[PDB]
């Protein structure tokens, strides 16, 4: 199937956030990601939040394009993989241990 | 309870504009709404700060005083968290919540001096290097900025819903004044600085005030603002100016130049320039004037070294700024910039995230730009 | 030959003070010594820069113009390296080396505009994001600072040992003036700006100059300096002031306020403040005034957007600075700070090392401090 | 013997440098080192240079204390090791492959 991968879900980035606009992507498909890099500007009602990568890897696919308003909590925003050979395998869209 | 701290420290603060405070207070004023906001916002802001205090060098974290601040914040945090699942529909909740706000504010009365003793204790007892110095600086700006912000929030709620049918400043909206006359706050800040300067130096310069309202030429300059913040900045700049002037001229025959205030208003900025002929400061020293506890007074009006950086926090708090420019040998200009428009006056708040963490776990890096030898080769052979 | 670039790029530049230039030229003036220094220093400085130009985004590196600059630098570098093992004891070497310096300088005549076309070509042809913008800024400040420095070095040697027994400025030491009268350079810079403003606007403000020599009260203010650098900064600030004033008042009845220059001298600083009543600039915009090619002129006296950042490079080059403070709705102060003491006036030079590399391979980080929503919740319900 | 280790020699940090004052140490015995970290201020006749670590590891021992003027080129300044268990082994003073 697909290789080991993680889906980044949109969290409640504020105690009352229920949705957010994906204002800008800060990483490009194919770029390395370390714990804490800036991934995206998420705009709400209350702030423009810098969303940080919580897990190190590589950006495989963006599921939710820039500009998409009103993305609900829990929406997969994008896909992370463990090695950069595994990116190409996601062009057309439990061993993470 | 540290998981609660982790979690709330990861939430982003919700910066509010003066417009919002004013529109909420004037047009709305729903106690329920305020409660829903604060019971969540206060813990977020507190947790963001606590996370940072935890990143301080262990030798500072170790001082009794820093421990006290931590426990105070922790006690406040825990006390607000009791409300996360309490219904605003019950009036009792609302009422006790108000009491809790009062309580946390009183507890947070000592915080500014306690942290100061904290770092003073530390600076004088442990050797001090510049990596750690700019770090304490960075921490303190942020830590005190949040303190300003909690106090702002708590003041709005208590002033609004305290139900005090005898308010000190009736036409205000909490602590916001919709028509703050700027020259009046300048005059007050000045008279109160004069008093203190006159008490010790037996003399004080005169104030001269001038205005230019480019927005509407002959009209007095008014802005929507928290008067006490404006007052504080002015007071502090005036004490500096008076000291500088009086000290320079006490051995002269010239007699004392005035302290000149120019207040201007444009499309975007309200600018207030305080000018003195107090001798100025060489360029090399301008930045450090803003270090907590940098002082040239006997360690008079001066001593602590808090006046300039704290004043600059009040200015930056609502998207303004405070800048200083000197001509060494003559005098200094100190300029407060405010937003003209309340719709543009957003809280500027410290966020704990990886960027902040990085500031605390930085490490000296090579200089970008060259430095000369402390003993350069004598080019005379 | 890239190993030679790697190696020299890893050497540190040797910053020189005005004192050293002056002491070398006055008391020493040994051609051999200068040659031993320059044959090594020039390649170091060149290699430090080339290493940085190589780190630019590929789409900028790709422009014909950037390639040209690279090859020019490479050709110069290779031409200086021919001397690393040539004896200063032979007079021929010394002589040809002088010719080589002249040659590289002429070749480096076009460099400033060629790089400008470079980045203009790029900014307008490829989309532009702020990560890459502050990077080009960082590169350009450094790249142009080295250019100032090569020219400084080459000028000293050629003026000293060019053997020209008919020198334009006889009592100078190369291009250094031991008694540069500051108000005279101010007046000259002003008259030459006036001419240009008068030619297009049919009118120009008057200059008023004032001095205060705290060092020695009635005495004219003199400093040891490169007059042409001082001239350049002043010229550029005056054109800005004249434009701002003339544009504001062309529709008024008031008649044109003067441009006021205050020149002061203290223990450490020589300060020059140029003040205009030309309407000022809102605080939000002050930093970007210093971006290469930020201009509000039809894209008159203005257009390029180089005047302010280049002037600030001349100021920072010898440990001075150039700062701007406005009161939006009235006018602006532009202040040049120089070191009073030549012994304190060291070259400030870009060093290529890991710190620099890091600036080019940075990556957007989360903001430290909060930002509001572009559409905040209407607090009126 | 001692575990795999590297001696950091004082290089010619300027084309004409022949000696340098070890003005300050920027890393402490036991601290991690990545390629390019600042290791020491080296003062000469001509500049105060920030000397950068050229190889990643751990600082095991400082051979030349702060303040030592006139250190000749090629003087071992300190010792680097590949793992932080290997530090203690240097208290009292070819598999680097
Ligand atoms: N207008 C001024 N002219 C000259 N020097 C000034 C001026 N304002 C500030 N300074 C310098 O900056 C220093 C620190 O300023 P600051 O107000 O922060 O602390 P303090 O005045 O020294 O004590 P306090 O905490 O009550 O303000 C002063 O001691 C003085 O050296
Ligand atoms: N004294 C001033 N008053 C108001 N605005 C100013 C002043 N000086 C500079 N500015 C602003 O800064 C901008 C850029 O300044 P700068 O001199 O760098 O470029 P330019 O004047 O626009 O063209 P040039 O390259 O020849 O200088 C100006 O276009 C103007 O908007
Ligand atoms: O949420 C968000 C908007 C909050 C508006 C109400 C604020 S002003 C609570 C009273 S401090
Ligand atoms: O080396 C070092 C000192 C150099 C002094 C001579 C310089 S000024 C060469 C002429 S530019
Ligand atoms: K946070
Ligand atoms: K201070
Ligand atoms: K270098
Ligand atoms: K510009
Ligand atoms: Mg003070
Ligand atoms: Mg210009």
Structure report:
Chains A, D: This is Dihydrolipoyllysine-residue acetyltransferase component of pyruvate dehydrogenase complex, mitochondrial. Chains A, D: Residues 5-81 form the Lipoyl-binding domain. Chains A, D: Belongs to the 2-oxoacid dehydrogenase family. Chains A, D: The modification N6-lipoyllysine is found at residue 46. The complex is a heterotetramer, with 2 copies of chain A (97 residues) and 2 copies of chain B (381 residues). Chain A is mainly β and 97 residues long. Chain A has a single domain, classed as OB fold (Dihydrolipoamide Acetyltransferase, E2P). Helices cover 0% and strands 40% of the residues of chain A. Chain A has a 4-stranded antiparallel sheet, with no helix packed on it. Chain A has a 4-stranded antiparallel sheet with strand order 5-4-2-7, with no helix packed on it. In chain A, a hairpin with a 4-residue loop joins strand 4 (38-43) and strand 5. Chain B is α+β, with helices and mostly antiparallel strands and 381 residues long. Chain B has 2 domains: 1-161, Alpha-ketoacid/pyruvate dehydrogenase kinase, N-terminal domain (Butyryl-CoA Dehydrogenase, subunit A, domain 3, Up-down Bundle); 173-348, 2-Layer Sandwich (Heat Shock Protein 90). Chain B has helices at residues 2-10, 18-28, 31-53, 58-61, 64-81, 91-107, 111-125, 130-161, 182-201, 227-249, 307-317, 354-361, and strands at residues 177-181, 207-213, 222-225, 259-265, 269-276, 321-327, 331-339. In chain B, the strands form 2 sheets. Chain B has a 5-stranded mixed sheet, covered by helices on one side. In chain B, strands 1-3 form a two-stranded antiparallel sheet. In chain B, strand 6 and strand 7 (331-339) form a beta hairpin. In chain B, helix 6 (91-107) runs antiparallel to helix 8 (130-161). Classes of the chains: A mainly beta (97), B alpha+beta (381). Chains in contact: A-B, A-C, B-C, B-D, C-D. The site of one magnesium ion has 5 residues of chain B, from helix 10.
